[PDB]
Design a protein around this ligand. Structure first.
Ligand SMILES: [Ca+2]
Length: 271
């Protein structure tokens, strides 16, 4: 009857919406290439608001279904089926949200870290340039000599020390930066990758729990990875590629070496 048809109709609309959002989030680019983290943050926030309202509608639908179940239909089976589909997709939606939380956090941190690395190397280049001017340019004119006398080398040395400390801070931060490059399908695998599960995934072949430590095996169908918990194909969004990021750590080491060279140069010029 009209009662049932309205239920099936309404449940189909909600299932359409959820399936739409799922396809958006699964096939989302959480890799090196995608930089617009602020836009993702805004979008995600908006999705959240949509879900807070949607919760009420879906709870209403579940109730409407339960009502229909009291009077045994020949349509009971497909009603129970739709009820289960709503519960399942609804929960999986929230789990996808857990993935978004984790990815926004770690990814924002990744971009921020590398930006800070660029900022630091910049200032080291400025320093090197200054020193090169001290030992290359003509210090003959009395103006230049007076400038040197007016210059506090001890203050320059304290600047250098402070910078050593900053660099140490960066080295520490690099030990916790995730891997974003190994997420793109255009990445060469020279071995298996460590994966950290950031949500609950649940199916016949495999069940993944939040925090489960897994191994990446290789690309499956778009947006999916064949991984090892039991081996199976899971949506790439369920996983962080945890530290260590060797690019990051080696970057900070490169900085420390360049800085040590500059300090040595400074001491050679001043003592
Ligand atoms: Ca001086």
């Amino acid at each position: 009857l009209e009662s049932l048809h309205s239920f099936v109709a309404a449940a189909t609309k909600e299932l359409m919406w959820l399936n739409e959002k799922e396809e958006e989030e699964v096939g989302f680019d959480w890799s090196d290439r995608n930089t617009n983290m602020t836009a993702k943050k805004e979008s995600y926030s908006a999705l959240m608001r949509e879900l807070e309202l949607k919760e009420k509608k879906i709870k209403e639908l579940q109730n409407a279904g339960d009502r229909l179940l009291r009077e045994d239909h020949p349509a009971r089976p497909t009603v129970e089926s739709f009820q289960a589909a709503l519960q399942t997709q609804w929960s999986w939606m929230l789990q996808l949200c857990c993935c978004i939380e984790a990815h926004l956090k770690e990814n924002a941190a990744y971009f921020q870290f590398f930006s800070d690395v660029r900022e630091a190397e910049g200032q080291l280049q400025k320093l090197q340039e200054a020193l090169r001017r001290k030992y290359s340019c003509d210090r003959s004119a009395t103006v230049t000599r007076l400038e040197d006398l007016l210059q506090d080398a001890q203050d320059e040395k304290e600047q250098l020390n402070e910078y050593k400390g900053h660099l140490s801070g960066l080295a520490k931060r690099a030990k916790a930066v995730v891997q974003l490059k190994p997420r793109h399908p255009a990445h060469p695998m020279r071995g298996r990758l460590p994966l950290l599960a950031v949500c609950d995934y649940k199916q016949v072949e495999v069940t993944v729990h939040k925090g489960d430590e897994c191994q990446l095996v290789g690309p499956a169908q778009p947006s999916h990875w064949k991984v090892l918990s039991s081996e199976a194909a899971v949506p790439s969004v369920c996983f962080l590629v945890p530290p260590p990021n060797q690019e990051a750590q080696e970057a900070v080491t490169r900085l420390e070496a360049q800085h040590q060279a500059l300090v040595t140069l400074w001491h050679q010029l001043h003592v």
